[PDB]
Symmetry: D2
Subunit: 178 residues, 4 copies
């Protein structure tokens, strides 16, 4: 984080044609301190201070910090084996990827509590049982009965909810947010 910030900070400062002294003057620091940050010593900078640094450099904290990181072994990562979520493999190389095996333990559609929508698309596959899906306007939603083997796609932000089909006991589906 500190090494990444060090590199990114120096890139942005040079990009806006500021020297150490110029940047220091806008941040209540000495140019020696800014030089220190560009040397990896920014580790203890606060979120608040980071916001100010991003601001004077006309950018975001995100632009001054390193990407999530690489946790892959030559391109891949493997994970061994009302609602219980069994989280599947995730990776910093694709942060929005959140795959899950969901056991649905309520078979009363009236218990379907709607989301407000997701950032990111979602793919679903019914592994066991039958699912009663609802989506859209929670006040008056669309509905579908998804039997085992059915597959579904839910676009970003579309609110949804589901339970197992009425009186069918329980259902299991795999849900992949990407």
């Amino acid at each position: 984080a500190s090494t990444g910030f060090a590199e990114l900070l120096k890139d942005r400062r040079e990009q806006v044609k500021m020297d150490h002294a110029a940047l220091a003057s806008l941040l209540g620091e000495t140019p020696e301190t800014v030089a220190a940050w560009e040397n990896g010593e920014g580790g203890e900078l606060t979120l608040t201070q980071l916001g100010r640094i991003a601001h004077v450099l006309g950018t975001s904290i995100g632009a001054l910090t390193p990407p999530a990181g690489n946790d892959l072994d030559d391109g891949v990562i493997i994970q061994m084996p009302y609602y219980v979520y069994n989280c599947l493999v995730r990776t910093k190389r694709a942060p929005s990827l959140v795959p899950l095996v969901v056991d649905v333990l309520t078979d009363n559609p009236d218990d379907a509590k709607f989301n407000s929508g997701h950032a990111g698309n979602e793919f679903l596959f019914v592994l066991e049982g039958e699912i009663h899906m609802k989506w859209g306007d929670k006040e008056n939603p669309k509905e579908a009965l998804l039997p085992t083997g059915a597959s579904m796609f839910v676009e970003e932000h579309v609110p949804h909810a589901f339970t197992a089909a009425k009186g069918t006991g329980s259902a299991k589906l795999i849900a992949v947010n990407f």
Copy 2:
């Protein structure tokens, strides 16, 4: 396609400050014909001709044609239920999404024929049996044994191959390219 091209063409032409006559002069057409295209009559234009139109407008055919389209019902789309691929739900709103249930009928790892890699990331989940996965350099690859319930992530372009574990008969996995 014609209506979309009509709108996009007129947008680009105006964006580069060209009038009908100017654009027509670069394409061996009359300005009336270009006006016609911007009126939805470009339907019979050839791929070759489209390439030339994109070229003189300093852009790509893609920039002059409409996006894939919307096949969703209020945000969602549902599909009812050596290798056999059972294609799951797809959508033009997320073209790169290609989910599959793969039945692996060869349990001889020596039969694993490597890919050359995918455009797009890939999430996998072993539904049945045990999978013998290989990835990377086909000449000397990485390998892992994925039992039922295991989940895996393969980064874009990483070549891979798989069969069921030696002498285990057959395996089944769900593979989601996104």
Copy 3:
């Protein structure tokens, strides 16, 4: 175009697990015809036909066609020297449209609005003084040397300052 399409078609087809025959039936074509397109023989396909091919493959025409192309000389392109005088453009950055605009009207009371662009815009006052209007509009009198940024979709108009005759701006859309 034909060769780029041949490569992208094959890739997409393989991507959706379709063999020549599978794709051909959906289009009402023979499998040899599809093989021919992937052999670079798709040059005469019409826009409408491309739309059908993209549709059955669940994608766009753009996803099956090559990028703009490269017109740079080792990464560079140069151009030697209301009236629009178009500056250098490149297929490597299509949305870049730099211009030298001659503003020949100096009656702000009669400026006309450009309902907004798709894309941001950077401007620099080359000569004279400009009277800019945007967004009961927001306004600004801008002397030579002044610079400005206009966000995508923001409507705006320009005129030379009241009775100053004319002015020049550099406008860079990107």
Copy 4:
């Protein structure tokens, strides 16, 4: 920053099915502390600590922090008027760095190279004549009014034409 982080933290946490206690244990914090961060009280978290929070949540610090912000006035920002004279910039388009460069060296034999930028660059010769070098370099003598495009990462240098004293360019990085 604190409020943006509070919102993004909660969203990401919910996204990975973690309740306050689940996230707190991984960080060696109490669940009340996490609740406090989502209550906008994360202002004093250090860069290193943010790195740990992002790590356990399998994302980047950037994904948990707000966008640059808005400094426009109804979509517009203006700026009234080798030496770099910085023109208008905006947090709504951070990579836009327009400049008026005073080229005070007129000995091409002694130009020095900028090993390439991250991002494209558009240039326009304001005054005098420029001697550009890029990429045994490629070269070009550019009179006033000439314009040019330099693709990302392409090394380049500028000097006024041999013995012409000085020149001025407008360089727009985007």
